[PDB]
Symmetry: C3
Subunit: 169 residues, 3 copies
């Protein structure tokens, strides 16, 4: 949403400059861009941005896609915490069974190439490496350029910057 | 708790099933099962979520209990930053008095245990290993199990997933 | 300050003494302690805290300064995520070219040795080791004392504790 680029303060010019440029590249198609932009935004917790990018991510994302990217955010929210947490315990709990349900990572709808990538984005924002890494893997395998994956990280990072600046005014 | 479940969308079923399972569970002291779901929901920072795990906790915890829980998140919000922080600085700050009071550490009511428990929980939501390890090494001393610390982590992670799941819908309309 | 200290609960007793203690600081400046305080509040994302600190802020800080601390939080918000993610990938992308504009960092408007203190404090709140370490290195290079940097870290953690503490009350009841 352009009203979103317009809401950014003047001491956060860079973020604006980075938002209009990331939100209109090409390296990623539309479903991969807006899909990541949507996932990242719900992950910032700033509803302003989620409402805006989402409104824009309707003329690009499919009905299933929207739910997908939002599901990714939902489920990485739990996992990013779990795995990073276990990871900090020197493997001392790797034996138990997490029990956490997550049939959705099997994507329950939409291509994994995209699901997986949006999960990357979210993991980048939440700060969980044991997840950021495996998704870069699951991706790299199914394909996806090293360029596309990087741009997504750039997307997560820029969405996070917008959230912060809009949350300072 | 049961109310909050009809909230999540069709795209977050896992979270739902996940939420009814962690509480339906019985791996730890019912108390340990709420000041952890509480301190944790408080850690998430979602107002809606903190309210529900606020309702079913109304004496589901021992009054001074909530104080300990909610006090765990509050004091950890400080600690998880300072310590994670000092831990990134190559140890060039390991000898400076972090004149930060945290006396609540000598927990109020609740015996100095479940504190380190939901404390541990909170540390997970915030991502501070430095703390997460100490509260675990200590928890594994006051005779606290391990399936229970694990159970706590599952709890911490699930509420966050519930937080994220909710906050997205709570905004869009 | 005072108005914010009284809004906090009883159990958050330790944070109180902390914000109160961090407030009447000598270690850092008026501009320093306050851009940090201001940038940290913005970083905790808590509306109320940004407001109380801002209100008091625009009193010890110049417009160019208040804007700088807010720009730091905004820009670190982008950078703390990118750099952290790239480090998680183990340099396997360390030179793919970020292509992310900054410069607010090159020239923030006010003296760097203050903008850096502010970016540092925010990187501690977001938890980016790559950034904290860079900004901490930079700081020493330009003359700031580790006591001062240590003071900024504390500020950030204490402010964080405030946000967390005030957040729960604001939610429940």
């Amino acid at each position: 949403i352009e009203k979103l680029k317009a809401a950014l303060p003047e001491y956060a010019k860079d973020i604006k400059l980075n938002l209009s440029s990331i939100t209109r590249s090409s390296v990623l198609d539309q479903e991969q861009l807006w899909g990541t932009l949507l996932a990242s935004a719900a992950a910032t917790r700033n509803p302003q941005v989620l409402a805006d990018i989402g409104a824009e991510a309707t003329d690009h994302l499919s009905a299933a896609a929207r739910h997908a990217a939002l599901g990714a955010a939902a489920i990485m929210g739990m996992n990013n915490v779990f795995y990073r947490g276990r990871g900090f315990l020197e493997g001392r709990y790797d034996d138990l069974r997490p029990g956490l349900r997550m049939n959705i990572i099997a994507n329950p709808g939409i291509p994994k190439a995209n699901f997986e990538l949006w999960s990357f984005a979210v993991s980048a924002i939440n700060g969980c490496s044991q997840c950021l890494v495996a998704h870069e893997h699951t991706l790299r395998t199914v394909g996806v350029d090293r360029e596309a994956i990087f741009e997504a990280l750039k997307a997560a990072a820029i969405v996070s910057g917008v959230a912060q600046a809009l949350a300072t005014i």
